[PDB]
Nucleic acid binder design. Structure first.
Lengths: 396, 206, 235, 432
RNA sequence: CAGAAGAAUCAUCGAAUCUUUGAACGCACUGCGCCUUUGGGUUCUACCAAAGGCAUGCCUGUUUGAGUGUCAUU
RNA sequence: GAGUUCAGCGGCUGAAUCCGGUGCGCUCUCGACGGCCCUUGAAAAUCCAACGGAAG
RNA sequence: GGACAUGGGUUAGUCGAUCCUAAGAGAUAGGGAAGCUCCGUAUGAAAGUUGCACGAUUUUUCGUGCCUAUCGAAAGGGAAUCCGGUUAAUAUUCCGGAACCAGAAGGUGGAAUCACGGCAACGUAAAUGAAGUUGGAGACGUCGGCGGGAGCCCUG
């Protein structure tokens, strides 16, 4: 429908048929048709019978399953640098955060106050599993401090003391220092045992002694591996029976310390592994990777990841699963956080139902770094997100 | 470089016929009629080509139809060809102009023709390639052609061609055809042969 | 059944590179074939031809101031078939006046005494006859070129004709055809606008390509109605 | 058993390259292409090009080995070799100065008939009628081009005859359905034996050859189509009972009578049946005569457009006088003066159109292409967000091959065109 | 002997069949190939089978070539 | 679940088929050396890799 | 009776041959010889099974570029199978169970837009490579002692 006077678009408009010229390209188009007839290869297909691609998607039904961490309403500010790591207490009322500034800030979740402003770089920080012993292990370079803030009840400080009262051990605005542990390498990730008697420290720089196990009952440290192969990126403890999970650069390894043996080596198939999270049931693992990929591992499915997810535009930094609610989060340097719902069914036939729930946005990105760490609330579907600008977003 | 055997034979025969001493009866065929006169020769010869096999049958069937319905001509004029026929014409002193091909393969087929043509008093010329003569007579090759009679229109043309051959082929060469041919050597060949000759003559006489 | 025509396996990059090197070879050969030799016969042959023309021109002019001037028509088609090196100046000018400055040039002429005497002067070089409606139509419709601002422009559209000839009520190719075939008031202006056609002989047969001095057997003189066949072999 | 050598079967054995096809047939590229034009042969790309190329990776065109083996026993190939022999005998005849024998050789020049090529390419007439449109497009394109040293005068004459015969059949059988006018030319759409035929006829103008197209390729396509059209026209004329070929009036052709020269002597199709149109000297008679006579309308035309006019200028029987010139000095009465677009709009819509709107000097209603069908939403010239995003970013999140990606082109291009031509009506209304 | 009922272990003989070899001829001496065409099967770009082909010297012709062999060509 | 050996029954049913220690031991093979060489110690089929950057 | 008579008996994608080459033999090219025949084995051979690639088709008569025998080993080299059971006579072959190799196409999932990490040696589920140019395995004497393992022997 292109002619002398078409209303479709305005080729050229001609006031009359007589003024219409002769198309000088007609022979060229006909010649191109000849060449296409006997030179253009002909491929035969199934003609893609009329089928809108909207039939390919299945039904996630988010309106039913919607523990929505809706838009953030509480913003915590005051940190002058990137919040490298943050953690929430077992009670869920205290959120301790830290970063390269070396300033440790404890925030009250319900009010948003920064009551504990004592500063005391911060690699990571993790609370103890015992409520009566709220000891926070904070890693600074090669030193880890077991700090028990006086904000808690007085008796809890004494309860945390008796837990302990390779790596060398040593025993201020309320600077209640209890135990300082120094390691040859700069520890990257920290993990706590279920009973609080064991501390796992992982460092990527070291090869022989990348991971160290610290027992508070004997007050000593040791290397769980006689011969460690490959760099170690993160470490954690199984939340159901005592396995130790080593997240290397490429693989995720399960080791039983009781037998001192290897259990399963999960092949992420990824250039670089960033961080890992474990479902409370212990048979599902979520892996964040530098390849902008999220890998869901089902220990009862296969060594290979059960599913692969590659929406992030930048490297996936942190992944965390909510301890009670069937939700998990993934924060990357792109400034956007992906919130997914993972429903785990104990039945063999029922495979886990993993569907997206929300894509949180409006987070500042500084020096190609956006979201650094994310934490789940111990009680409800509330998310603490740490940005590179010192902003902590509470996604209720 | 590795030439094929037949290509090597071809080029060696070319050089060998040059280095050797060619007798005067065989060396006179190295000196052919010039390019201008040969063009004028073949202009006259192409007005007397023998009629083609189709054109002859075309004429004969034309006369056959006339008698088939119901029912004196002129003597045909053309060029005379064929070695035995032409030699018989020269000895009969009937040929006016004999044109000998310069590369008849067994050369002795035509080696006596320049002498026989000069003995009988016939103007003759040696022209290039056996194929040019063959083309005139609708053949692949003619060892020799001859002209005995031409129409009164072309009597003056033939008298001019005969004079040109006399001036450019017989008056020319002449002494050059009485000399042994060959012995021609390259630019550097004599110097190489002189070194070889003096080396051989020194003590290599066995 | 889903057959798709993929991109051609022609490699357009190397194709146009091969186009350019072939063109560069043509320019190389064109600048290479220079200064052929001239034998003595060709010089005499020209002189005999020039004397042949001089006698012809004198005999046509002296005591022969007449022309048979074909009738029952007003439009004639004149094609310059042959040319001779170093024409006599009188012949050179008449060909220039009739706009036959190059060989195979064809021009419409109004049949009258003035064009007839000029054609008689230049008779051995031009083949002329009476075009019909069919010959006039296809010649303009397939080889008509106009004088737009003094360059040779194809008559692809009627807008240019209307722009350059609107004062004489000439708007279309068909209007041009009607004016030419009827010899109207603006016939002189239309012929002025029209470029002379270039009816070069066509060599399609293998025999045509090989034979020398091929000019389709273009005879000279007034060919009458046969020129329609000659145009038909061309357009 | 034996160890099977790698790449001795499968795609490596089924597909053959172009060069290997050349050496197999002992053909040259120009002759291999020419036989590929006449036959139905074309490149075929395999799924695994590297495997089919014996492990190599150079970009190489592929053909079926079975397709090539079918060309080993082609009688046309021996005709290509016979032409090479004849061309050399002609060369020897002329080079030896034998003009008459050259003429005899030219008379007995080896020619080949494309009978079995058409049969083996199109088994049934309806198969030919399907891919007949490309042939008709080319024969009409080359029926108006000037003669070249590449394409002969006989070929041009045959193209005109075959095109005119087909136009005569369509007019006689009233098989024409739609005629559309575009800048490229005139698109005709007819139906024969149920099949649909669509071709293009350009406007007659003194164009120039682009000089970038290879006319050797055009020669073989013209040769193939002319044989195809000849046999198609023979059957169509036999179907109508008309003797084939129709006789040619030499005098009428000499006077440029067009279709009137060929007389078909016997061995909403009536949209304009009760009408006598007249043609002025500013309109495409080669197109208007075709459509009007195809739909029953009688035609008279200006004498300068061609002899054999049944009507004159002064004949009062003229119902309509088509004239695209903006000025008519000798205006008639009862012969209402319209523009050419009136006729073709009537053809497309199958109804009589508004002569007042199409009268001389009036505005021109927009041209409608009958080939364009109404789209799903394209403009014809005549709480939820959370569920939506969840249902839209799960296939790009979870689905394996992400074949849903095709929406990025199917919906995107259609929506952009729909948005443009839907907002166009808003702009034009605002301008009004 | 048994069994069968134009017979016949008949004659004549002009039509046919004629396995592997052998001058022995695709290559070898249980095998190993290539080329053209056709066909099959729980079944098809795979596999299989069938048919017709492929020795050497030379002669006549045909086509395609090679040659710094002999020339012609404004 | 096979085999072997014991018990039975009328094919069937029971059990066991285990834990060691070893040696200039014999046989075979592999690894790491040390000599003597001299004449410094078969070939090919076959498979793999590197340099290279044509093409998209 | 290993005699005679009558019947029965040898089952393989994985074991051998088949494929490769060895010393040598040997047809072909050419040359001898009256001759049955002999010499000769890349030799003054036009020594290429479709030697290979390139091209909008090149005056619809093909141009450009590149690279330039066979036999002879059932002990040498070499893709791949074990266990249990079964016969009057056959078993890595048959039966039952369990594997392996080679080649062939599509399909499904995964991977890169010609992939990353580690100072490095190098690693990984992937990670195109034409012409042309190389490298490695095959593939390499013999003797002595030591170390390792298996089976067998000894024995609680």
């Amino acid at each position: 429908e292109e002619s002398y006077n078409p209303p479709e678009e305005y080729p050229k408009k001609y006031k009359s048929l007589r003024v219409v010229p002769a198309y000088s390209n007609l022979i060229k188009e006909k010649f191109e048709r000849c060449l296409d007839l006997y030179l253009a290869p002909r491929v035969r297909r199934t003609k893609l019978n009329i089928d809108p691609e909207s039939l390919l998607p299945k039904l996630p039904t988010p309106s039913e399953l919607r523990p929505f961490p809706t838009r953030c309403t509480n913003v915590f500010i005051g940190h002058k640098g990137r919040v490298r790591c943050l953690s929430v207490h077992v009670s869920g009322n205290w959120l301790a955060s830290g970063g390269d500034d070396g300033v440790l800030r404890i925030w009250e979740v319900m009010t948003g106050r920064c009551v504990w402003k004592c500063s005391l770089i911060i690699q990571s920080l993790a609370w103890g599993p015992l409520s009566d012993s709220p000891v926070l292990a904070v890693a600074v370079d090669e030193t880890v401090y077991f700090i028990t803030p006086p904000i808690f009840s007085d008796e809890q400080i004494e309860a945390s003391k008796e837990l302990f009262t390779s790596a060398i051990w040593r025993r201020l605005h309320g600077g209640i220092v209890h135990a300082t542990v120094s390691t040859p390498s700069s520890i990257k990730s920290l993990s706590w045992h279920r009973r609080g008697d064991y501390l796992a420290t992982s460092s990527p720089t070291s090869s022989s002694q990348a991971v160290l196990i610290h027992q508070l009952s004997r007050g000593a440290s040791q290397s769980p591996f006689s011969k460690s192969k490959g760099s170690v990126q993160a470490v954690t403890f199984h939340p159901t029976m005592p396995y130790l999970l080593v997240a290397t650069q490429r693989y995720v390894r399960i080791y039983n310390l009781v037998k001192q043996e290897l259990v399963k080596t999960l092949l992420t198939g990824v250039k670089w592994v960033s961080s890992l999270s474990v479902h409370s049931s212990g048979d599902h693992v979520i892996i964040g990777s530098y390849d902008k990929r999220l890998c869901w591992f089902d220990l009862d499915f296969s060594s290979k990841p059960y599913k692969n997810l590659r929406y992030h535009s930048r490297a996936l930094r942190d992944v965390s699963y909510h301890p009670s609610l069937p939700l998990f989060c993934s924060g990357s340097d792109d400034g956007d956080v992906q919130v997914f719902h993972g429903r785990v069914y104990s039945d063999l036939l029922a495979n886990p139902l993993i569907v997206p729930l929300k894509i949180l946005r409006n987070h500042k990105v500084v020096d190609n770094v956006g979201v650094l760490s994310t934490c789940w609330h111990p009680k409800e579907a509330w998310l603490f997100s740490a940005g590179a600008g010192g902003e902590i977003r509470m996604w209720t | 470089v590795k030439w094929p055997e037949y290509i090597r034979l071809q080029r060696r025969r070319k050089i060998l016929n040059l280095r050797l001493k060619v007798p005067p009866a065989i060396a006179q065929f190295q000196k052919t009629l010039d390019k201008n006169t040969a063009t004028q020769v073949f202009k006259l010869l192409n007005k007397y080509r023998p009629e083609t096999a189709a054109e002859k049958k075309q004429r004969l069937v034309a006369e056959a139809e006339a008698v088939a319905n119901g029912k004196v001509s002129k003597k045909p004029y053309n060029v005379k060809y064929g070695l035995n026929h032409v030699v018989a014409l020269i000895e009969a002193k009937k040929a006016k102009l004999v044109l000998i091909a310069s590369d008849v393969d067994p050369i002795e087929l035509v080696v006596f023709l320049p002498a026989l043509c000069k003995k009988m008093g016939v103007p003759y010329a040696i022209v290039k390639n056996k194929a040019r003569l063959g083309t005139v007579i609708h053949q692949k090759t003619a060892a020799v052609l001859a002209v005995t009679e031409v129409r009164e229109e072309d009597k003056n043309e033939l008298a001019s061609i005969v004079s040109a051959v006399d001036a450019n082929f017989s008056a020319k060469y002449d002494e050059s055809r009485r000399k042994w041919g060959g012995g021609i050597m390259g630019g550097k060949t004599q110097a190489l042969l002189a070194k070889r000759a003096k080396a051989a003559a020194a003590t290599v006489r066995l | 059944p889903e057959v798709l025509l993929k991109k051609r396996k022609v490699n357009e990059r190397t194709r146009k590179e091969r186009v350019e090197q072939a063109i560069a070879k043509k320019e190389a050969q064109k600048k290479n074939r220079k200064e052929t030799f001239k034998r003595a016969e060709t010089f005499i042959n020209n002189y005999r031809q020039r004397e042949r023309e001089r006698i012809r021109l004198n005999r046509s002019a002296k005591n022969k101031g007449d022309i048979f001037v074909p009738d029952e028509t007003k439009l004639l088609f004149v094609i310059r078939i042959a040319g001779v090196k170093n024409m006599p100046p009188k012949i050179r000018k008449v060909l220039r006046l009739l706009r036959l400055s190059r060989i195979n040039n064809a021009v419409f002429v109004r049949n009258n005494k003035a064009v007839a005497q000029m054609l008689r002067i230049v008779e051995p070089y031009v083949m002329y006859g009476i075009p019909n409606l069919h010959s006039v139509r296809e010649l303009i419709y397939k080889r008509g070129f106009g004088k737009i601002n003094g360059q040779r422009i194809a008559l692809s559209d009627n807008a240019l004709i209307e722009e350059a000839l609107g004062k004489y009520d000439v708007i279309s190719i068909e209007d041009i055809i009607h004016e030419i075939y009827n010899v109207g008031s603006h016939f002189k202006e239309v012929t002025k606008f029209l470029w002379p056609f270039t009816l070069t002989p066509v060599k399609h047969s293998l025999m045509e390509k090989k034979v020398k001095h091929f000019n389709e057997g273009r005879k000279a003189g007034y060919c009458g109605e046969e020129i329609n066949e000659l145009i038909k072999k061309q357009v | 058993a034996r160890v099977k050598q790698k790449g001795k079967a499968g795609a490596a054995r089924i597909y053959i390259t172009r060069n290997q096809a050349l050496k197999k047939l002992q053909l040259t590229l120009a002759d291999f292409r020419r036989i590929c034009i006449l036959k139905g042969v074309y490149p075929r790309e395999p799924k695994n090009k590297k495997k089919a190329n014996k492990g190599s990776t150079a970009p190489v065109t592929f053909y079926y080995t079975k397709d090539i083996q079918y060309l080993l026993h082609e009688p046309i190939v021996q005709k290509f070799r016979e032409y090479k022999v004849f061309a050399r005998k002609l060369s020897k005849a002329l080079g030896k100065g034998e003009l008459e024998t050259a003429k005899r050789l030219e008379a007995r020049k080896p020619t080949y008939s494309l009978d079995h090529i058409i049969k083996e390419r199109y088994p049934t007439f309806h198969d030919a009628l399907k891919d007949i449109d490309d042939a008709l497009s080319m024969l009409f394109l080359f029926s108006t081009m000037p003669v070249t040293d590449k394409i002969g005068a006989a070929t041009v004459a045959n193209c005109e005859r075959l095109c005119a015969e087909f136009q005569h059949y369509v007019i006689r059988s009233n098989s024409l359905r739609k005629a559309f006018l575009s800048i490229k030319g005139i698109y005709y759409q007819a139906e024969i034996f149920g099949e649909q035929i669509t071709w293009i006829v350009p406007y007659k103008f003194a164009q120039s050859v682009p000089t970038d197209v290879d006319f050797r390729i055009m020669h073989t396509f013209l040769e193939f189509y002319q044989a195809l059209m000849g046999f198609v026209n023979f059957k169509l004329y036999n179907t109508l009972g008309l003797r084939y070929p129709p006789k040619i009036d030499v005098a009428k052709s000499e006077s440029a009578a067009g279709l009137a020269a060929y007389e078909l002597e016997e061995s909403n199709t009536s949209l304009f049946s009760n009408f006598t149109f007249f043609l002025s000297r500013e309109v495409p008679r080669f197109s208007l005569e075709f459509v009007i006579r195809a739909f029953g309308g009688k035609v008279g035309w200006d004498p300068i457009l061609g002899s054999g006019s049944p009507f004159s200028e002064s004949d009062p029987v003229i119902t309509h006088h088509i004239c695209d010139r903006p000025h008519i000095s000798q205006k008639y009465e009862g012969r209402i003066y319209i523009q050419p677009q009136w006729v073709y709009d009537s053809i497309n819509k199958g109804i009589l159109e508004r002569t007042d709107l199409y009268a001389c000097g009036a505005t021109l209603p927009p041209h409608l292409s009958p080939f364009v069908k109404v789209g799903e939403n394209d403009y014809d010239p005549e709480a939820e967000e959370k569920e939506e995003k969840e249902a839209k970013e799960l296939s790009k999140m979870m689905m394996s091959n992400k074949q849903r990606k095709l929406y990025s082109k199917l919906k995107n291009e259609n929506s952009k065109n729909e948005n443009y031509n839907n907002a166009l009506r808003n702009r034009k209304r605002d301008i009004e």
